[PDB]
Design a protein around this nucleic acid. Structure first.
Ligand SMILES: [Cl-]
Ligand SMILES: [Cl-]
Ligand SMILES: [Cl-]
Ligand SMILES: [Cl-]
Ligand SMILES: [Cl-]
Ligand SMILES: [Cl-]
Ligand SMILES: [Cl-]
Ligand SMILES: [Cl-]
Ligand SMILES: [Cl-]
Ligand SMILES: [Cl-]
Ligand SMILES: [Mg+2]
Ligand SMILES: [Mg+2]
Ligand SMILES: [Mg+2]
Ligand SMILES: [Mg+2]
Ligand SMILES: [Mg+2]
Ligand SMILES: [Mg+2]
Ligand SMILES: [Mg+2]
Ligand SMILES: [Mg+2]
Ligand SMILES: [Mg+2]
Lengths: 123, 123, 123, 123
RNA sequence: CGCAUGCG
RNA sequence: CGCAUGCG
């Protein structure tokens, strides 16, 4: 009904700036939504939040807390060659990964280096 | 089960400085938590946020964002005689109140003078 | 072609938050535009900036610098009964009025008290 | 007419601290001003902004926003051997560069390592 | 308290 | 450097 690329681009078009943690969260939300076939509920929920006057950022946090697939979900791993591969406005939002990070607690993704070292992206 | 005073003391124990906007947030949190019997789940949430690398200040903010009693809650009105009754480190964080302030958006409390004039505390 | 009220409301609908210095600047821009019959050039210039991807705030500053009526213009006086009459997100942007304040240098308006004391709103 | 070195010294004389992002901005300003013969109008704009109550830091920002040579100007690339060659008080203000940085948007300079890796300075 | 964006 | 908004 909507593709993960169309949704991503729709959400990107509502976000201030570029390569922010919320941008990374768009990618995470759309990849988990595609793999669990929930892109349409994510889409509808997004556009309802906007219609009620929430910020797109609020709308994305609301998604992580309301849509079943993100509830209790662990952040997905993203492979990187170096910290230079991390989006350009996330660098100050990185921390060691805790034992049980959750998307509904602001853990967007786990960046993983070639040596297996990990960095948690945190909202 | 922890009492309101014990939770306040643990939280004050983690905070930097004296009479800050976050010391004021501790009192608001402990009072609402006591009235909804949420003191324990607030304590669990404080210590869970610290464990994943939140500052104490941020961890108090996480309480307002995740503990159900703080969802959409209006800040308490605190009656004062003069501006000097507000802790000095809170002064920089005062501003006129919005139409419908909410604790989970940063509005800690509303100071109110005898002639009904107000000063909002916003982190 | 467009009324000062319709334009104001259009510009207000693009501005983040409420009662900010840029909100006051909308009122100033639309009152000087009405009195000099330049509301339509102000309107067209505003919507061209947005179409090119400028922020509404950028668009308003661009207006003060490009539209003849604001060039070398002094801030208009606004009468107030007290500092409480100043929009609720301008309080930290007030200063003594200089001898020659200009709109194209970020002097939005001059607030004047009943005793004749003045406060400059500065961007 | 003031020389580049004299203008730098006047500006350093107004600034707090040592090796800050604003000391770096002074050097960029003085170098571009010297190359476009804008040193005098930069000096006039610095002293005009101070006179109307701008901090020295803000007054340097006003130069980039009002003096024509800084309009849409790209930050200079400064070649370095290591990160330690960047003044220590500038480190907090480093970030990855955007596609098309502009001085009048806050991009003071771009530090460049021997292998071509970059660090932007953003106030 | 901090990050992001916008603006000076 | 600061203000504004958003978010934690
Ligand atoms: Cl980009
Ligand atoms: Cl990957
Ligand atoms: Cl880090
Ligand atoms: Cl403080
Ligand atoms: Cl106190
Ligand atoms: Cl309002
Ligand atoms: Cl009036
Ligand atoms: Cl003041
Ligand atoms: Cl500094
Ligand atoms: Cl240095
Ligand atoms: Mg964007
Ligand atoms: Mg202490
Ligand atoms: Mg507000
Ligand atoms: Mg109200
Ligand atoms: Mg608004
Ligand atoms: Mg100094
Ligand atoms: Mg940028
Ligand atoms: Mg580039
Ligand atoms: Mg913003």
């Amino acid at each position: 009904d909507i593709s993960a690329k169309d949704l991503r681009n729709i959400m990107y078009d509502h976000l201030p700036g570029f390569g922010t943690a919320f941008h990374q969260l768009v990618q995470v939300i759309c990849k988990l939504g595609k793999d669990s076939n929930s892109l349409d509920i994510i889409h509808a929920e997004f556009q309802a939040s906007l219609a009620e006057g929430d910020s797109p950022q609020c709308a994305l946090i609301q998604i992580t807390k309301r849509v079943p697939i993100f509830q209790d979900a662990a952040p997905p791993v993203i492979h990187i060659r170096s910290r230079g591969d991390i989006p350009r406005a996330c660098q100050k939002s990185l921390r060691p990964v805790p034992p049980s990070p959750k998307i509904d607690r602001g853990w967007v993704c786990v960046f993983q280096l070639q040596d297996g070292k990990t960095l948690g992206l945190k909202i």
